[PDB]
Amino acid sequence: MATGGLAIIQSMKHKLPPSERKLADYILAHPHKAIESTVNEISALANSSDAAVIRLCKSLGLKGFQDLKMRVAGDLAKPTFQG
């Protein structure tokens, strides 16, 4: 409920359109940066668009980018994802 952000992104990595894919790739590669980024920052980092970040979040069943960041942060809190 406050976790699973990385699992949900990794699950869809190969089922996402291009613009959403660039985003999922950057977040998976740099999840610590991702949880401290704005929509404008993450879209620039993934060479994608602001609209694609919102679409990515909706594609995953999330309320938006804050939800995505919270759920990723929840995973980074776990020993399962620490290291």
From Swiss-Prot:
Residues 3-79 form the HTH rpiR-type domain. Residues 39-58 bind DNA. This is Uncharacterized HTH-type transcriptional regulator YbbH. The lineage of its organism: Bacteria, Bacillati, Bacillota, Bacilli, Bacillales. The gene is ybbH.
